[PDB]
Amino acid sequence: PFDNTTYKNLQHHDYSTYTFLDLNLDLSKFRMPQPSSGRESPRH
Amino acid sequence: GWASTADPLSNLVLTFSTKEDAIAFAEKNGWSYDVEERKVPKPKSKSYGANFSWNKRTRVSTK
In the record, which residues are listed under signal peptide (chain A) (predicted)? Predict the structure, then answer.
């Protein structure tokens, strides 16, 4: 049923302070390996 | 307590365009002289992008 009268963006009422960081932690398993610059730090 | 002196040539400073004019003036007046060569700065290599290198140690920690 098509409905143009309600607001469907209601999930942000239930977001906590750590929602972004837990989402990033869950996303960390899907990521590709990062490239390396060949050194630990520019001060190394 | 003032600064007294007995040297008349203390405030003598002479200006010459080149080294050879100064050498000729010193030899003409009979003054024993020493001469030191001119020190110019060596040309450096400056690059603004080197502050944001990818793998070199020349990255700046802050800007």
Answer: none
Structure method? cryo-EM
A14/A3 Cα distance (integer angstroms): 23
List Cβ neighbours of B62 (8 Å cut-off, separation of 6 or more): none
Q: How far apart are CA B24 and CA B36, in angstroms?
A: 15
State how far the alpha carbon of B16 is from the alpha carbons of B23, B28, B57, in Å. 10, 14, 46
Backbone angles phi, psi at A22, to 5 degrees: -65, -35
Tell which B residues from 42 to 61 touch A, by Cβ distance under 8 Å. Answer: 53-59, 61
* Cβ distance of A42 and B54 shorter than 8 Å: no
